Design a binder for this molecule. Structure first.
Ligand SMILES: OC[C@H]1O[C@@H](O[C@@H]2[C@@H](O)[C@H](O)O[C@H](CO)[C@H]2O)[C@H](O)[C@@H](O)[C@@H]1O
Ligand SMILES: OC[C@H]1O[C@@H](O[C@@H]2[C@@H](O)[C@H](O)O[C@H](CO)[C@H]2O)[C@H](O)[C@@H](O)[C@@H]1O
Length: 752
């Protein structure tokens, strides 16, 4: 066979002969392919190749595209490594009124080029090593080699030379304001402040000219926060400690809900006595959550301005952040003041819904929709309908989770395949370049895990490894593997340091990598929490908890700017739709209207969505701005998503809008998402808004000693919600002294 058996399921090991289903569209057909054959990595990098990284273009392009190892941007070329910093004069905020788009971006310039004395014509740049957030790029020309070590959160670039020495080349002569022989402080013609470091005795030459040279086979470059010799002296201390290892280790304390992450480097000395450590540049989502024991390592005045706001300097081997996991739910409970017969009707209406495509994404949206309806059907006493939805889920997954047909041949569609070259599970039919660019695996597979988590909630037997569980856990491994996974790189999607996932597998853009729907990422993480809890997989659960909680911290900074500190004042919208390494867009990957540029970071609504309601002033600010722009509450598209979002702070208003318009159209209509977004239903919309109306506001100030919970607060009156996935009753302690007993396989309140 060209298939590997996993419990009752299987994946392909040879590329299937695709069933194109008579579709001739060149786009659709090109989608049904594989990621690039050529990987630019040396023979030192073996095993499943890392993807979905800030540095991906180094691996995919012969050289690289523009990359953002903050505070720097860099790019590999035949001539060497171009180095740049966006100063305020490089930054712009542009609006296209007719498109309804905004762009915050810098420039693709060159402050200087780091060069090798022996060649300006390297053949390629390869990935020679990487760790949790640094990369080692190797520019290669036979005996001539230049190895560049750099990373997000590193104000150093470390440069190692073979068969040559260091050259720094400038278009306009820099100002060398400090000359210590082997160490120089310099500024570009336009006043960007840098430093360069060589070992003692290896003195810089060409001071005053456009080309600075050093005979050493090792230099470091630093971005300096200020033209300041005291800072230069501090940067000297770690300029010879090249980062070799970097690890973000975490723990989840289930009793308190605290997610603790330690970021640790291990360096190699390039001069005698070089300390084992570095100067880290911390992002807002890190330093705003800095542990007490790390506070003394801060270099208070060491600030860098970047697209994500202000970075700050911290010195040493490690630092720690502390975050609070807020819980998730399998769905909202039965606590609304809805008309029950009206909800039952909408539940039956949803039997008309069908997927709007055969690809993993459209099919994903559909199964997430069914998985969302089934607990509501249970709650309304419609157990036979709930079972129909779960049966349809089972039928869909039992199809997709087998790579072979009844005769034992590979299927042409509705299957998964292991690309060995990169080491990734791909689904066919594919879309959004999920296969050709290894894009969005969390977005797509998150919907599959949702379907499986809802099945598992009602049927533990189905979810066992030897049954359909093994294939689900394989999908999960693809997008969030642990270390030393034989088939997959570590935490594919996630960048533990930038604190968010990256959607593009290749990152071949001059803006670095990107993420549009942070909510579909949070959806993926929620679903792994639910799945792992249902199936008794503690290690997997805690990993998804760490991801959910960390991703949340990046979202509130860089998507939402809840603290009003990151977006430039002149930027009109109250959200960034797509975050890049180097820029921020109020824009979508498809041609869209006004609502979608907000709501793509809200959808889908589910039992893990309550994170969206932690900052009520933000929810109001964002809503009101979209309302201002629309000019009324007549939403251009996806009205139901707006109402559901509005319910976080004002469910009376959400109810009123809903009552006025929910029944404007009848049954599922793919051509019309004015009222109901195609991944959503009337039943979901109606259930959510009424639940929020009775419960009040999300209360993130209360934690619990178990992971599957929520706490709401209505005018000082708290409602506590727990779902118990266990065969035994549990007792849950909340952080405000409240405690509750929960029966097996049930909610504490609102089971229906
Ligand atoms: O990059 C991640 C996102 O990619 C999007 O597809 C892009 C195409 O629309 C565009 O024409 O080409 C680029 C490659 O140059 C594609 O990456 C997907 O639609 C998104 O779903 C995805 O997150
Ligand atoms: O409403 C029809 C339009 O929908 C678009 O799909 C969006 C996806 O591209 C994006 O990845 O996710 C959102 C939310 O699920 C979808 O609305 C299509 O791209 C458009 O071609 C289509 O006109």
């Amino acid at each position: 066979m060209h298939a590997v058996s996993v419990g009752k399921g299987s994946y392909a090991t040879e590329f299937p002969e695709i069933d194109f289903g008579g579709i001739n569209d060149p786009g659709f057909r090109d989608q049904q392919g594989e990621p690039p054959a050529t990987i630019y990595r040396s023979d030192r990098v073996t095993g499943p190749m890392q993807t979905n990284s800030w540095w991906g273009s180094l691996a995919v392009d012969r050289f690289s595209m523009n990359q953002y190892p903050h505070p720097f941007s860099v790019r590999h070329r035949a001539e060497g490594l171009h180095v740049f910093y966006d100063a305020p004069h490089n930054m712009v905020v542009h609006e296209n009124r007719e498109a309804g788009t905004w762009h915050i971006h810098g420039a693709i310039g060159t402050d200087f080029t780091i060069k090798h004395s022996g060649t300006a014509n390297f053949e390629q740049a390869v990935v020679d090593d990487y760790n949790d957030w640094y990369v080692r790029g190797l520019l290669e020309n036979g005996a001539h080699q230049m190895a560049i070590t750099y990373g997000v959160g590193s104000p150093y670039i470390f440069v190692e030379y073979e068969d040559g020495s260091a050259v720094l080349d400038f278009d306009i002569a820099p100002d060398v304001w400090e000359m210590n022989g082997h160490v120089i402080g310099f500024s570009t013609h336009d006043h960007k402040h840098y430093a360069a470091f060589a070992p003692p005795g290896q003195n810089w030459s060409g001071i005053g000219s456009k080309t600075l040279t050093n005979n050493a086979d090792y230099i470091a470059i630093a971005k300096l926060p200020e033209k300041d010799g005291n800072m230069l002296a501090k940067f000297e201390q770690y300029a010879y400690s090249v980062v070799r290892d970097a690890v973000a280790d975490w723990t989840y304390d289930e009793a308190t809900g605290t997610v603790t992450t330690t970021f640790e480097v291990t360096t190699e000395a390039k001069v005698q006595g070089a300390p084992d450590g570095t100067i880290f540049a911390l992002y807002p989502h890190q330093y705003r959550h800095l542990a007490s024991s790390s506070e003394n390592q801060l270099l208070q005045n060491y600030q860098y301005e970047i697209i994500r706001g202000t970075m700050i300097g911290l010195e040493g081997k490690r630092f720690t952040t502390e975050l609070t996991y807020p819980g998730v739910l399998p769905s909202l409970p039965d606590l609304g003041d809805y008309d029950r017969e009206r909800l039952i009707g909408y539940l039956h209406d949803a039997t008309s819904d069908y997927p709007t495509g055969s690809d993993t994404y459209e099919l994903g949206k559909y199964i997430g929709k069914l998985a969302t309806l089934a607990p509501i059907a249970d709650q309304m006493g419609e157990y036979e309908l709930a079972e129909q939805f779960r049966g349809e889920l089972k039928d869909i997954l039992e199809d997709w989770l087998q790579a072979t047909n009844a005769s034992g041949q590979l299927k042409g569609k509705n299957l998964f395949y292991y690309n060995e070259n990169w080491g990734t599970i791909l689904g066919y039919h594919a879309a959004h370049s999920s296969a050709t660019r290894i894009n969005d695996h969390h977005f797509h597979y998150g919907y599959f895990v949702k379907a499986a988590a809802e099945i598992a909630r009602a049927d533990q037997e189905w979810a066992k490894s030897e049954n359909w569980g093994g294939m689900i856990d394989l999908l999960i491994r693809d997008f969030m593997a642990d270390r030393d996974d034989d088939l997959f790189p570590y935490l594919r999607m996630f960048d533990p340091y930038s604190g968010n996932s990256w959607a593009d597998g290749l990152a071949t853009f001059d803006a670095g990598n990107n993420q549009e729907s942070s909510s579909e990422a949070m959806h993926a993480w929620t679903n792994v929490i639910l799945w792992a809890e249902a199936t008794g997989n503690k290690a997997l659960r805690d990993r998804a908890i760490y991801l959910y909680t960390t991703e949340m911290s990046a979202i509130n900074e860089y998507f939402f700017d809840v603290h009003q500190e990151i977006f430039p004042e002149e930027y009109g919208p109250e959200i960034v739709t797509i975050n890049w390494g180097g820029k921020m867009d109020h824009a979508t990957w498809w041609n869209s209207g006004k609502v979608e540029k907000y709501a793509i970071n809200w959808l889908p609504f589910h039992g893990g969505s309550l994170y969206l309601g932690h900052h009520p002033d933000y929810v109001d600010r964002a809503y009101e701005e979209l309302r201002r722009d629309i000019g009324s509450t007549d939403w251009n598209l996806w009205s139901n998503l707006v109402w559901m979002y509005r319910a976080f702070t004002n469910p009376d208003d959400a109810l009123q809008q809903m009552e006025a318009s929910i029944d404007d159209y009848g049954l599922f209509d793919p051509g019309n998402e004015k009222i109901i977004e195609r991944g959503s239903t009337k039943a979901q919309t109606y259930h959510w808004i009424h639940n929020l109306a009775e419960l009040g506001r999300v209360d993130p100030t209360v934690t619990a000693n178990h992971p599957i919970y929520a706490v709401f607060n209505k005018n000082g009156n708290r409602t506590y919600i727990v779902y118990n996935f266990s065969d035994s009753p549990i007792t849950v302690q909340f952080s405000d002294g409240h405690s509750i007993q929960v029966e097996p396989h049930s909610f504490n309140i609102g089971n229906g």
